[PDB]
């Protein structure tokens, strides 16, 4: 926001911060569905304590979906959860908040170890039996599996397509004051 | 001590429920309907809690 | 929010309504008169009767939005033209089909 001979020059977008907040909320919701879609695909009664991340030790799809969702929650790049934290820190730097950046970093590192701590519990002495039995065989829901496939695609390669989501969210937020 | 006799004789109101009517049925009617739906849903939830 | 002219115009008194048909009839007449004059600045006193009709029919927020939009339109019309904008957008899209290589070893600044 500069002025030259009573003419105002505006190089800053006021609605960018709300778009970043919306992107963070949406990314968290997408990753939260991804972790809980794997849970809803299994015997929900098998997950009671934190040590029972070993139950996810099963055929490679459930195991890798769980570990990648946990890594995404912790903010490990280039997963979808990393993008929101990176954009939040970028906007805080743009808003010139070094103390807020410091406290965000403290919270991020503590929460990241909080998430990746459970990756140690996933090691199990044998493959687990966490699927419900229907018609004498394990019930694997193809629809939930497909949902997890889509969420995994947008969690692994979502950083390549994040620009369009950013455009959509900035467009939505641009209506707040106009 | 000031009394507006023109407004007095132009006033046909005979009860103190006029602000309540003007609220729950003119302007705050949205919240009136919201409270009705709230009480209906609360009765449903009370039945479900009893069950 | 307190600085938003649009959000302040969206506010209204209880029971206040806008006769949009009458408002836009008056606005069309007044703006037709103004465009017939076609001045750099909108001198509303040069279209007296239509100015009074526009003031009476339209609300303050509606007139404020109309004047802001007229200023924006006048600026855009003084700056650009249809064919120029079409060619510029075509060139911009064609360039967007490529890459922006850095200008290594520049000659300025």
């Amino acid at each position: 926001m500069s002025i030259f001979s009573n003419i105002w020059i505006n190089n800053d977008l006021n609605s960018y911060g709300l778009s970043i907040l919306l992107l963070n909320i949406i990314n968290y919701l997408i990753v939260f569905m991804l972790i809980l879609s794997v849970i809803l695909l299994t015997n929900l009664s098998k997950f009671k304590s934190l040590n029972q991340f070993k139950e996810f030790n099963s055929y490679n799809f459930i195991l890798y979906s769980l570990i990648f969702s946990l890594l995404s929650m912790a903010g490990i790049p280039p997963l979808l959860g990393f993008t929101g934290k990176f954009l939040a820190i970028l906007y805080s730097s743009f808003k010139s908040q070094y103390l807020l950046i410091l406290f965000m970093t403290i919270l991020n590192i503590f929460g990241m170890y909080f998430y990746i701590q459970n990756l140690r519990f996933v090691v199990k002495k044998n493959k687990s039996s966490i699927l419900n039995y229907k018609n004498y065989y394990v019930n694997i829901n193809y629809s939930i599996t497909l949902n997890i496939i889509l969420l995994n695609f947008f969690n692994f390669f979502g950083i390549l397509f994040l620009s369009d989501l950013i455009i959509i969210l900035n467009y939505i937020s641009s209506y707040i004051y106009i | 001590i000031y009394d507006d006799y023109y407004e007095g004789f132009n006033n046909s109101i005979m009860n103190d429920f006029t602000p309540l009517t003007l609220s729950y049925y003119s302007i705050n009617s949205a919240e009136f309907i919201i409270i009705g739906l709230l009480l209906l849903l609360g009765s449903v939830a009370c039945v479900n809690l009893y069950k | 929010m307190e600085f938003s002219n649009a959000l302040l115009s969206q506010t209204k008194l209880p029971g206040q309504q806008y006769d949009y048909k009458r408002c836009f009839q008056a606005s069309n007449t007044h703006f037709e008169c103004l465009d017939s004059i076609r001045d750099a600045y909108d001198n509303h006193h040069k279209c007296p009767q239509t100015y009074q009709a526009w003031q009476s029919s339209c609300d303050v927020g509606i007139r404020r939005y109309q004047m802001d939009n007229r200023e924006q339109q006048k600026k855009d019309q003084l700056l650009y033209s249809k064919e120029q904008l079409k060619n510029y957008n075509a060139a911009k899209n064609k360039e967007a089909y490529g890459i922006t290589a850095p200008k290594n070893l520049s000659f300025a600044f």
Partner: protein, 93 residues
């Protein structure tokens, strides 16, 4: 959420102030800077702060010994006579 009604179903005493404030806010390009007079009139109608400050000053001045006797009033002539004037219906006769 401004009703515009009084407690007897009539008109709120600050409705014209609110209407003028809203008219100024919608009309002005810089309503915060330009509608100070109308906004302050509405705020004075709502919070009678100026009247309360006046009452505080009047109480402080009445705590002093400046004023002894106010002029008495008679409605038949609709006028104020000095307290020293021996009129009818006076407390001291």
């Amino acid at each position: 959420s401004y009703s515009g009604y009084s407690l007897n179903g009539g008109v709120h005493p600050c409705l014209p102030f609110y209407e003028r404030m809203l008219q100024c806010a919608k009309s002005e390009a810089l309503p915060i800077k330009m509608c100070t007079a109308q906004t302050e009139d509405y705020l004075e109608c709502h919070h009678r702060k100026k009247q309360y400050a006046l009452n505080y000053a009047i109480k402080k001045e009445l705590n002093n010994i400046r004023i002894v006797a106010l002029p008495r009033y008679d409605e038949e002539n609709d006028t104020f006579v000095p307290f020293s004037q021996a009129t009818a219906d006076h407390i001291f006769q």
